[PDB]
């Protein structure tokens, strides 16, 4: 079933006892922390085998 990704992430936050509005009020921060955390994976794997 298709669903917008920022609505999937609100359901996923609601599953850890954190109220949905926490995502929508912080979506920029949460997206930047995610994109930055993915960036560290490439640096980690590139840094050492």
Which parts of this chain interact with another protein (CB under 8 A)? Answer: 4, 6-7, 11, 21, 24-25, 27
**Shortest CB 12 distance to another protein, Å:** 12
**Shortest CB 37 distance to another protein, Å:** 20
Secondary structure of 14-48 in HEC code, one letter for each residue: HCCCCCCHHHHCCHHHHHHHHHHHHHHHHHHHHHC
d(CA 10, CA 15): 9
Read off the tokens for 23: 């995502």
- Of 8 and 40, CB closest to another protein: 8
**Shortest CB 35 distance to another protein, Å:** 16
């Amino acid at each position: 079933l298709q669903i917008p990704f920022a609505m999937q992430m609100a359901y996923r936050f609601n599953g850890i006892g954190v109220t949905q509005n926490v995502l929508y009020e912080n979506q920029k921060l949460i997206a930047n922390q995610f994109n930055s955390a993915i960036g560290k994976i490439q640096d980690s794997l590139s840094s050492t085998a």
